Design a protein around this ligand. Sequence first.
Ligand SMILES: *[C@@H]1O[C@H](CO)[C@@H](O)[C@H](O)[C@H]1NC(C)=O
Ligand SMILES: *[C@@H]1O[C@H](CO)[C@@H](O)[C@H](O)[C@H]1NC(C)=O
Ligand SMILES: *[C@@H]1O[C@H](CO)[C@@H](O)[C@H](O)[C@H]1NC(C)=O
Ligand SMILES: *[C@@H]1O[C@H](CO)[C@@H](O)[C@H](O)[C@H]1NC(C)=O
Ligand SMILES: *[C@@H]1O[C@H](CO)[C@@H](O)[C@H](O)[C@H]1NC(C)=O
Ligand SMILES: *[C@@H]1O[C@H](CO)[C@@H](O)[C@H](O)[C@H]1NC(C)=O
Ligand SMILES: *[C@@H]1O[C@H](CO)[C@@H](O)[C@H](O)[C@H]1NC(C)=O
Ligand SMILES: *[C@@H]1O[C@H](CO)[C@@H](O)[C@H](O)[C@H]1NC(C)=O
Ligand SMILES: *[C@@H]1O[C@H](CO)[C@@H](O)[C@H](O)[C@H]1NC(C)=O
Ligand SMILES: *[C@@H]1O[C@H](CO)[C@@H](O)[C@H](O)[C@H]1NC(C)=O
Ligand SMILES: *[C@H]1O[C@H](CO)[C@@H](O)[C@H](O)[C@H]1NC(C)=O
Ligand SMILES: *[C@H]1O[C@H](CO)[C@@H](O)[C@H](O)[C@H]1NC(C)=O
Lengths: 306, 229
Amino acid sequence: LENVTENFNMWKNNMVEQMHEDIISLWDQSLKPCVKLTPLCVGAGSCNTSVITQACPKVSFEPIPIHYCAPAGFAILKCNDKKFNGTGPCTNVSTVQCTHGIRPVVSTQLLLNGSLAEEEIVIRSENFTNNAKTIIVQLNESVVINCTGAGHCNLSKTQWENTLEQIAIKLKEQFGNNKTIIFNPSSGGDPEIVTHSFNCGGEFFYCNSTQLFTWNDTRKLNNTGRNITLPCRIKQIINMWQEVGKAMYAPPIRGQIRCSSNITGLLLTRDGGKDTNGTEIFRPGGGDMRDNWRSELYKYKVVKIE
Amino acid sequence: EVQLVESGAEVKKPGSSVKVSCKASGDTFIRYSFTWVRQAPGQGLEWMGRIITILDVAHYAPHLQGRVTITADKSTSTVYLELRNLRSDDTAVYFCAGVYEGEADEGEYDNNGFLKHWGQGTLVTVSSASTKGPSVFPLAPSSKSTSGGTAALGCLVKDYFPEPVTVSWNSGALTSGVHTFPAVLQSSGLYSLSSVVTVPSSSLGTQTYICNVNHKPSNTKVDKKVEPK
Ligand SMILES: *[C@@H]1O[C@H](CO)[C@@H](O)[C@H](O)[C@H]1NC(C)=O
Ligand SMILES: *[C@@H]1O[C@H](CO)[C@@H](O)[C@H](O)[C@H]1NC(C)=O
Ligand SMILES: *[C@@H]1O[C@H](CO)[C@@H](O)[C@H](O)[C@H]1NC(C)=O
Ligand SMILES: *[C@@H]1O[C@H](CO)[C@@H](O)[C@H](O)[C@H]1NC(C)=O
Ligand SMILES: *[C@@H]1O[C@H](CO)[C@@H](O)[C@H](O)[C@H]1NC(C)=O
Ligand SMILES: *[C@@H]1O[C@H](CO)[C@@H](O)[C@H](O)[C@H]1NC(C)=O
Ligand SMILES: *[C@@H]1O[C@H](CO)[C@@H](O)[C@H](O)[C@H]1NC(C)=O
Ligand SMILES: *[C@@H]1O[C@H](CO)[C@@H](O)[C@H](O)[C@H]1NC(C)=O
Ligand SMILES: *[C@@H]1O[C@H](CO)[C@@H](O)[C@H](O)[C@H]1NC(C)=O
Ligand SMILES: *[C@@H]1O[C@H](CO)[C@@H](O)[C@H](O)[C@H]1NC(C)=O
Ligand SMILES: *[C@H]1O[C@H](CO)[C@@H](O)[C@H](O)[C@H]1NC(C)=O
Ligand SMILES: *[C@H]1O[C@H](CO)[C@@H](O)[C@H](O)[C@H]1NC(C)=O
């Protein structure tokens, strides 16, 4: 550990933007659409769409862990604490060569294969007061989730029920104990944000996460169900996360696509409610892959040599 | 299960531009990708291009890039094919063809190259000639050539334009035992076909033979008495 006190701000961390831009370029030479459409305006309202048609090679895009080592004239500083807001003065900081192996998983609503919370479930937010700022949840115990191009994902109803609890409890432990915690599905928006979207085998899965976010701080949902089955769908025409615009990928082909990932975290986003009675409603969120990266770099910060 | 309807056949002059319509009905428009396939007379299918409708993107044939465009009006449910700088060789029957793609309105898209649903076809004649009704000339029944059984006679629809032309004998009765030949393009820029009917000579002089030629384009319907002259 480094014997000094420094400031950290994962919400304004620059490595996030440095990885994000990398992960995008890690996408332009691995997953290339058959056609990519992107807004093109002079400002005069009228906006032509810039079209691009390239080969559409079916590649089973399988993410490789990524390290981030400071070159020279630069040093990475890691924060150490069982519960770090990731936005303030860190006491147990410590210089490191490369950040832990991170598997740049691009997804929405659920953070897959990320890094678990050592102690307990932690939830960071650039401002919990602002019903506009994504709440990044960090699970201390991942929940396996298996998706298949066959059309769905299975999740443990047990583990997911617990998780919502040990999350619902960490929420009120920030918005007011004497406050009811509820979970509802997406409010609306793009398919990629409304469902738990992500990529598996180069196939863009779109799983309906209603059964994962319709939890009332009162009842249950395990009648005749041992596992939660999200009705997933693979799309060819998708909205790009790298930049405003659609992109069409070629249909599936491999006799079988399969994924078994660790739900290591979520991206929630409680609704304003305009100071109404203690009844905070949290819904799935994300779509801004940087929050993802953040959830992984929340305790890092590269700095110039002295 | 869609049904494709096309715009009318148009007679365009060299260096011009033509736009053929194609009404798509009977199903979800945006779930189809439409393709234009042209075919010159006597010639065979030539891929003109295809529009991934829903995406509003269209790719074209190399030898056409620049002079062709494919667009779709999702509102009216129509697809259009526009060729500019028309040459004579562009003269052909332009087919409208489509294929289902899947719940495209839902992100699913097969992006199929084949064409399951075809249009009725729209003919476009790109020539410097001018619209002009035909002229029917009777073909004297071989009276000094064939006998004993039956003799063949007919008509010679010469110098007509643009196309096409229908033919029937005896007001539409003797349509049997008749061989109406495909028209032929003359150096002038005009076409000319021929119709014939091998019928018994013993019926020459009682059944006044008359081929009924029509040419809606010029709006000129012609009837000619083929007397055993
Ligand atoms: C379309 O976008 C282009 C930008 O490349 C612009 O110059 C043009 O004025 C717009 N209008 C057209 C051609 O549709
Ligand atoms: C954090 O994880 C431990 C087990 O790893 C669990 O016992 C504890 O309750 C969790 N904290 C909560 C409730 O968020
Ligand atoms: C997910 O698949 C793994 C094997 O990779 C299996 O051990 C686990 O039981 C599955 N989880 C489900 C279907 O709940
Ligand atoms: C919750 O608010 C306070 C705790 O700050 C507590 O004393 C009070 O009894 C509770 N009232 C409500 C909102 O039920
Ligand atoms: C699945 O999601 C749709 C919207 O994406 C929702 O309307 C529907 O009721 C959901 N079905 C389930 C599994 O409850
Ligand atoms: C949440 O509560 C509503 C009404 O009380 C109920 O219809 C819904 O099923 C509950 N969510 C689940 C499945 O736990
Ligand atoms: C609810 O269902 C789960 C499996 O889906 C089961 O493990 C659990 O025991 C059930 N609840 C009870 C205690 O009846
Ligand atoms: C990560 O996910 C796999 C896939 O189900 C699971 O089997 C494995 O135990 C998980 N490892 C972790 C991070 O605990
Ligand atoms: C890690 O998560 C990804 C999600 O994109 C999944 O495809 C992969 O299988 C997971 N790791 C394992 C167990 O292979
Ligand atoms: C909270 O519930 C509703 C919110 O719509 C409000 O009308 C009511 O006054 C509040 N308190 C009660 C009655 O629970
Ligand atoms: C580390 O311990 C030394 C004791 O001399 C102290 O000067 C320094 O401030 C400490 N650093 C930390 C962890 O704050
Ligand atoms: C960091 O240093 C503090 C001060 O002694 C100590 O309490 C804490 O356990 C250390 N954290 C770790 C395990 O790096």
